[PDB]
Design a protein around this ligand. Structure first.
Ligand code: 8XE
Length: 345
């Protein structure tokens, strides 16, 4: 029973020599050596039983990963848990280990156009699969994109993922959101619950911009400030864009703002590929209905050297509907997690 960052990892003795990788609100990620497999792996400790919201997120993450199988998406190799519900205090997800992530890479390394193009293709390829399953990632950011030495890319962290619900997306002005702020689409702040696929596309665009400059494009200091940054670059929303916002609080705030003109991408990224800037423009579109879709993004001239529809697979068993996990108490949710993880025992 080794310890990391104050946390006890009951993964011994099959897994030994734990090293810290990252943290979350209710979980921790470590690397370890898999005795009898002769390889180093990644192990995520999850402790969601004390909170209903966490139990919902856990069941969804596990359910998705267990059904997903794709080169550009992190899979589950094993799941460690106590033999009984009474003894089950945490859940350990074992995954393949990746050398690093894009967050770590961008802090130190300048990316060549070839790398940017290749990284972006792999993200969209993975995302095509995700969206074909009727799933939304809802937390795509550099620290959630893993890399190895040969530049293979894998999407990780399906903790905030859900089945898409387009008919129940509308909401009020400045309603609270759990996803990372810098990669949050403008509509989250104004009228969206983030239940549509276009939410992931915005994030990818934010990632593409960051790959171009090694700096976040919309670095809001806080929740209120995030929209300030987006509008500062994109400029004032058009009449057409404004008519899709029917919540009066949101629309009236937008109308109350001074006129601002759009800042051209070539002024922010003067060294960037002109085709890359074109694709970035369609990803970072204010109106979520006008925003480019994953399959369209792949067919974009910027990625023409990788684009192969036959080699970009989709899911065999897409999720029919989102589970009503919200209502269920921390107790029934635990029992469902227990049953989902039973096969690995
Ligand atoms: C508890 O947090 C939940 C959210 N979350 C945080 C970031 C993360 N990273 C890996 C992972 C998986 C495999 N390899 C790596 N490698 C790696 C990255 C950096 N440094 N290294 C070594 N990271 C899984 C997760 C994850 O799911």
């Amino acid at each position: 029973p080794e310890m990391v960052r104050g946390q006890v990892f009951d993964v011994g003795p099959r897994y030994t020599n734990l090293s810290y990788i990252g943290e979350g609100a209710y979980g921790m990620v470590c690397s370890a050596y898999d005795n009898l497999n002769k390889v180093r792996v990644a192990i995520k400790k999850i402790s969601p039983f004390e909170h209903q919201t966490y139990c919902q997120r856990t069941l969804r993450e596990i359910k998705i990963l267990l059904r997903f199988r794709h080169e550009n998406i992190i899979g589950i190799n094993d799941i460690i848990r106590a033999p009984t519900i009474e003894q089950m205090k945490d859940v350990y997800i074992v995954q393949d280990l990746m050398e690093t992530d894009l967050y770590k890479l961008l802090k130190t390394q300048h990316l060549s156009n070839d790398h940017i193009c290749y990284f972006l293709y792999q993200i969209l390829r993975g995302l095509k699969y995700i969206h074909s399953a009727n799933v939304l990632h809802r937390d795509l950011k550099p620290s959630n994109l893993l890399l190895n030495t040969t530049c293979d890319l894998k999407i990780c962290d399906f903790g905030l993922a859900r089945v898409a619900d387009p008919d129940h997306d509308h909401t009020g002005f400045l309603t609270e959101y759990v996803a990372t702020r810098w990669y949050r689409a403008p509509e989250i702040m104004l009228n969206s619950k983030g239940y549509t696929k276009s939410i992931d596309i915005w994030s990818v665009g934010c990632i593409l911009a960051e790959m171009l400059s090694n700096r976040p494009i919309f670095p809001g200091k806080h929740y209120l400030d995030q929209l300030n940054h987006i509008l500062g670059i994109l400029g004032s929303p058009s009449q057409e864009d404004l008519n899709c916002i029917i919540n009066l609080k949101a629309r009236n705030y937008l109308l109350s703002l001074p006129h601002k003109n759009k800042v051209p991408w070539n002024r922010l990224f003067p060294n960037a590929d002109s085709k890359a800037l074109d694709l970035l423009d369609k990803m970072l579109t204010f109106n979520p209905h006008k925003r480019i879709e994953v399959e369209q993004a792949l067919a974009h001239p910027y990625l023409e050297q990788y684009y192969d529809p036959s080699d970009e697979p989709i899911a065999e068993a897409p999720f029919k509907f989102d589970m009503e996990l919200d209502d269920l108490p921390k107790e029934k949710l635990k029992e469902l997690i227990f049953e989902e993880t039973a096969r690995f025992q």
